[PDB]
């Protein structure tokens, strides 16, 4: 994360850590949606370019964690995969459409103070929160910048940007199962996800029930907090009938 | 789901969540 802060312990409950489990290795962030589904970027499992093609026997996950390093005992929670969801039409060779994936895991989780669910958007949420200006909240250990590892859990509430800024910013063909944010150069504020931080949640607390809520999924990013940069996000609620594969 | 137990459920804003709802007026 650039230009965060070290998050209060227990501000994200549904923070996970996508592991390689020899040798261990941060790989990415992803969120806690149930007691046994993790959601995920599919660019943190399966991008060729880049010769990641992970499998259930090479990845572990770590939710209820705060530090980095540090092992916590009995706070943090070690889990391995049964079974990996990488969406049928998430394009890798081109555009990064459809950028997430389901991790299930083997046996259920125990939930606590640390570890608990974060909510899927309904039409209603999608539709009262999804407005630029917005500010949204973006939390990793990736990256303080463009390489740095952050040893406690970073956190930065980023802006909902319009989409003609989002395409303009970019030469990348945006989809609608997209979208970008962070501050504009006139904006006199800071801030973006980085190496690290892909698949990790973008969330948005709703005032009408007081819920926090996943709007989307850390994506691509052309560079960390680059000036007429901004970061993408999976949209997750237009991608929530697919999230089928639970039943 | 959402409600944090540490926060949402002791009924205890984090320190930036005021950013949130700044941005919503
Ligand atoms: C797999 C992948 C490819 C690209 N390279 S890219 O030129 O931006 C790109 C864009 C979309 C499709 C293909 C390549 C970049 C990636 O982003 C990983 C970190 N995500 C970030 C999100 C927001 N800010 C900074 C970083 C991950």
Redesign the interface.
């Given at each position: 994360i650039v230009e965060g802060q070290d998050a209060e312990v227990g501000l994200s409950p549904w923070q996970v850590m996508l592991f390689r489990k020899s040798p261990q290795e941060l790989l990415c962030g992803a969120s806690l949606i149930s007691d046994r589904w993790v959601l995920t970027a599919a660019h943190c499992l399966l991008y060729p370019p880049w010769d990641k093609n992970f499998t259930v026997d090479d990845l572990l996950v770590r939710i209820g964690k705060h530090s980095r390093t540090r092992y916590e005992r009995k706070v943090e929670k070690i889990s391995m995969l049964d079974k990996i969801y990488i969406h049928p039409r998430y394009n890798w060779k081109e555009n990064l459409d459809r950028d997430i994936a389901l991790l299930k895991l083997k046996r259920p989780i125990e939930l606590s103070d640390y570890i608990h669910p974060v909510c899927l958007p309904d039409k209603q949420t999608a539709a009262k929160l999804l407005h630029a200006g917005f500010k949204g909240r973006v939390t990793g250990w990736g990256n303080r910048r463009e390489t740095v590892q952050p040893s406690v859990l970073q956190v930065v509430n980023l802006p909902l940007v319009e989409r003609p800024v989002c395409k303009a910013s970019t030469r990348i063909r945006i989809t609608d199962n997209m979208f970008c944010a962070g501050y504009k150069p006139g904006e006199g504020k800071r801030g973006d996800a980085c190496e690290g931080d892909s698949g990790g949640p973008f969330v948005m607390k709703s005032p009408y029930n007081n819920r926090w809520y996943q709007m989307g999924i850390v994506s691509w990013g052309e560079g960390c907090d680059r000036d007429g940069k901004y970061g993408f996000y999976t949209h997750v609620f237009r991608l929530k009938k697919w999230i089928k594969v639970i039943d | 789901?959402?409600?944090?137990?540490?926060?949402?459920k002791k009924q205890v804003q984090?320190?930036?969540?005021k950013?949130?709802?700044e941005?919503?007026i």
């Open positions: - | 789901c959402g409600l944090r137990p540490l926060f949402e984090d320190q930036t969540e950013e949130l709802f941005s919503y």
